[PDB]
Design a protein around this ligand. Sequence first.
Ligand code: HEM
Ligand code: HEM
Lengths: 137, 137
Amino acid sequence: GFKQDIATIRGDLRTYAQDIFLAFLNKYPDERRYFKNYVGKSDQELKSMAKFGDHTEKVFNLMMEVADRATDCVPLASDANTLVQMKQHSSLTTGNFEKLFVALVEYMRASGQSFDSQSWDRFGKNLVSALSSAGMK
Amino acid sequence: GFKQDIATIRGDLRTYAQDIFLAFLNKYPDERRYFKNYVGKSDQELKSMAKFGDHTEKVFNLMMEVADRATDCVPLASDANTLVQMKQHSSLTTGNFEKLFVALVEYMRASGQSFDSQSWDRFGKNLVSALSSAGMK
Ligand code: HEM
Ligand code: HEM
C-alpha cells in the first residue's frame, strides 16, 4: 500500500527520482522553463549531470518525508506551508504541483511495480488543497 | 457517503444524538462515571431530562462541524486542539473517544439507513490520532 510504496521508492530513490522527474518534464514541456540548466538537454544528458541527480533526489527525499508524515494521505499543514514559502517556489501556482502528481501517478500505473496509485492520486489532490489553504495561488 | 451522512444526522440531530449516546453509555457502563446525573437511570428517564438532551445535542452539533471541516476523514489540527483543551475533557484519554466511535459505528451498521460506516470508522481513528498529537494521553 501507501506505506510500502514509500519504502519502495526510498530503496532506490536516485533511480525513481530521475525517471519520474523526466516523465514530468517531457509530459509538460512548459515546466522545464523553471529549471534553466535543464533546457536543451536530452534525457541521457541530464542523467549524466551531477546536479540533476542530486537535485531530483533532494526533491523526492522531501516528498517522501511529507508523505510519511501524512495521515490517511492528508499532509500536515506545516509541511504544506514549508513548500509554499520555500524561495525556490515563490513563483509557482498549484497548477504546477497538480501536473507533477499526474505524471507521478501515470508513471506508477505504467510501471510493472505494484504501487498504490489511487492513494498517490489522493495524496496529490490533498497536497494541492493544502497548498491552496496555505496561500498558494 | 461521509458528507451525505453529516447531512442526514443534522436533519434529525436531537434524535440521532440521543440514541447514539445512549448506545455508547449502555455498551460501556463505566463511561457513565464521567456524567454524574446519569447513573441509575433507564433510557426513557434520561430522555426526559432536559439537561441530557441539551448536552448530547451540543456534543453532536460540534462533532458534525468537526467532521464537516475534515478533509478525507482527517480532522483539522485546530479542532483536535479544541477538544483536548476543553475543561470538560481535562480528565479524559483517547480511550474514551475510541469507545464512543466504536459505539457510533456499531449503531450505524445496526440501523437501516445507508450510512458509510467505514468512513466513520476511519474518521474516529484519525481523530483519536489527532487527539494524541494534541497532547491527550
Ligand atoms: C510537493 C512536491 C515538491 C517538493 C517536495 C519539492 C522540493 C524541493 C526542494 C527540497 C528543493 C531544493 C533543492 C536543493 O536542495 O537543491 C526544490 C527546488 C526547486 N523546486 Fe521544488 N519541490 C516540489 C515541487 C516543485 C514543482 C511542482 C516545481 C515547479 C514545476 C518545483 C520547482 C522547483 C525549482 C525551480 C527549484 C529550484 C531549482 C533547482 O534546484 O535547480 N518544485 N524543490
Ligand atoms: C469528538 C467527540 C466529542 C465532542 C465533539 C464533544 C463535545 C462536547 C461539548 C461541546 C461539550 C460542552 C456541552 C455544553 O455546552 O454543556 C462537552 C462536554 C462534555 N463532554 Fe464531550 N465531546 C466529545 C467526546 C466526549 C467523550 C468521548 C467523553 C467521555 C465519555 C466526553 C465527556 C464530556 C463531559 C463529561 C462533558 C461535561 C458533562 C456534561 O456536559 O454533562 N466528551 N463535550
